[PDB]
Amino acid sequence: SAVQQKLAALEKSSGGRLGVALIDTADNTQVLYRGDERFPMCSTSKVMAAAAVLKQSETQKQLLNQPVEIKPADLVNYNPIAEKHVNGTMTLAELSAAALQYSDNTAMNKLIAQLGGPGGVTAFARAIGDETFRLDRTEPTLNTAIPGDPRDTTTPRAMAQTLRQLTLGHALGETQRAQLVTWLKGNTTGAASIRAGLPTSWTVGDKTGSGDYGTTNDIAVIWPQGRAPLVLVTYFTQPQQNAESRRDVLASAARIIAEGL
Numbered sequence: 001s002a003v004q005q006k007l008a009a010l011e012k013s014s015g016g017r018l019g020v021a022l023i024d025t026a027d028n029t030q031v032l033y034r035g036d037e038r039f040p041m042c043s044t045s046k047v048m049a050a051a052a053v054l055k056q057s058e059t060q061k062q063l064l065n066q067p068v069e070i071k072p073a074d075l076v077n078y079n080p081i082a083e084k085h086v087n088g089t090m091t092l093a094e095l096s097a098a099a100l101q102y103s104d105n106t107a108m109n110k111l112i113a114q115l116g117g118p119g120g121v122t123a124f125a126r127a128i129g130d131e132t133f134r135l136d137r138t139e140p141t142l143n144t145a146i147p148g149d150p151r152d153t154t155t156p157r158a159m160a161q162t163l164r165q166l167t168l169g170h171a172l173g174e175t176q177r178a179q180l181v182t183w184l185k186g187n188t189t190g191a192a193s194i195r196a197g198l199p200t201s202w203t204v205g206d207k208t209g210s211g212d213y214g215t216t217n218d219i220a221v222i223w224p225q226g227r228a229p230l231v232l233v234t235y236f237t238q239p240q241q242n243a244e245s246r247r248d249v250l251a252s253a254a255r256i257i258a259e260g261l
């Protein structure tokens with residue numbers, strides 16, 4: 001299609017590998033580009049981990065308010081919130097917000113630990129019907145983004161379907177879905193990514209990610225003015241291990257998608 005032409009040209013100009021999956025919930029139409037190829041999720045995997053803890057809280061009713069110890073040795077490579085609470089505690093709700101809205105990697109490791117390790121995140125994915133997602137490692141090694149390595153990857157098609165079920169469908173209970181959407185809408189890291197390619201009047205909740213090989217990712221739920229929501233995944237990775245981030249490529253992909261509606 002014409003959108004296919006434009007996405008391919010954007011990819012060729014970028015020098016990297018671009019993966020796009022859109023679901024338009026107005027009519028269940030889709031736009032897919034490399035939609036069945038695996039890409040390293042990096043920090044976008046935090047959505048699955050926070051959602052899995054939310055699901056646990058449906059039956060452990062006070063789980064989100066349980067204190068979790070933060071030790072100096074727990075700090076990893078990017079810990080803007082957890083570093084303020086070392087030698088103290090944060091609750092699982094606070095850790096979820098830190099992971100999602102500030103992309104705190106120590107907070108993500110606490111979510112993973114609550115779930116019993118990376119396999120617990122994968123098990124939640126399987127429980128909600130996602131047979132493609134896999135989490136294999138903790139932070140920071142889940143971000144190595146090595147070409148051909150299936151660890152810590154998913155496909156754009158699978159992640160868009162799962163993000164729709166989590167934020168607009170019934171994979172979570174009503175209050176928990178609302179909490180996840182509230183957290184995504186309050187993200188601090190997203191203005192240069194999918195959001196930058198969309199009309200300013202549209203409402204976006206998103207989670208970004210980045211890693212080695214210049215990996216630059218964003219996954220979003222979008223409420224355009226006057227119409228039903230969209231779900232958009234944009235994943236991007238590059239040939240050189242030390243490549244620079246390319247958030248502009250994600251914005252350009254979203255802009256192409258928004259024009260083609």
Ligand SMILES: *C(=O)N1C[C@H](NOS(=O)(=O)O)CC[C@H]1C(N)=O
Binds near residue numbers: 078103
């Ligand atoms: C997640 O991809 N990471 C944690 C933090 N995320 O910030 S981003 O979502 O704005 O990219 C830093 C980058 C990355 C990592 N390598 O840990």
